[PDB]
Backbone:
């Protein structure tokens, strides 16, 4: 059923995306990790920052409403492009990617009250690009947060 | 299958423990094995000052000695940050999720930017206070919860 369970979870997620008119804010897919929600950087953060935008709070609440209806563990993954960052607040792409996953989880737990034990923050820096970083188009899609719904 | 792979993990842990003994590192790190793989445990005070995620200069010798050991094996590495239940809300770290993740990231950045270990071998992981060693009732238990674990993943 792990095969059927994964299909049924992905259909439930895609049904939630459609019923809530969220297609332009997020996509959903399945891979070896489980069912993954992909959010581009622009719907969550400013450039080079990890603070959840105020206009992102409605989207994250809508995701949290879906997440409360399932028991699976959640892994929030942060990613950067290969562009160098080196500020006081984010001394490398490792810190930036991990701070973005952390900011999403802090929203889910502190303000939507989902149980903290359901979450793990993961930072990949630029080690998992979609394709590459040779163009501005390609670097843009690498700046993304992925919410992994693990197998249960 | 597993017995071939668990006996392999047994030999890796023995190698790690021997590396710790031979380099006089017992007071600065321990090693263990569990379902994740072979894990190096470093208490926060050998890496960071209180409430910060910047690697201390005096930790760089230990991280170099760890990097030399990691260069001899191909395994993927997961660096895990852990906090206690003490709340933090500063400019650089709005909460324990951020602090734990930044501490894992600072260790990895040193490995990749200073020791030349390939970035593709690492992932940074933050657990906040969701994985204590025992509890957060006493000062000694809260202290041991503030730790970094370097997980040598299976092959």
Residues:
């Amino acid at each position: 059923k792990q095969e059927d369970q994964q299909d049924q979870l992905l259909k439930k997620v895609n049904t939630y995306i459609k019923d809530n008119h969220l297609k332009a804010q997020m996509t959903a897919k399945r891979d070896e990790r489980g069912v993954v929600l992909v959010l581009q950087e622009a719907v969550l953060f400013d450039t080079g920052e990890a603070k959840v935008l105020k206009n992102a709070e409605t989207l994250l609440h809508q995701i949290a409403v879906l997440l409360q209806t399932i028991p699976n563990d959640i892994q929030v993954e942060g990613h950067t492009d290969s562009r160098n960052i080196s500020t006081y607040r984010y001394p490398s792409n490792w810190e930036l990617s991990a701070a973005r996953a952390s900011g999403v989880i802090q929203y889910f737990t502190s303000k939507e009250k989902l149980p903290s034990k359901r979450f793990i923050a993961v930072g990949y820096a630029d080690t998992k690009p979609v394709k590459d970083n040779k163009t501005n188009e390609h670097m843009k899609e690498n700046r993304r947060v992925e919410i992994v719904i693990k197998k249960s």
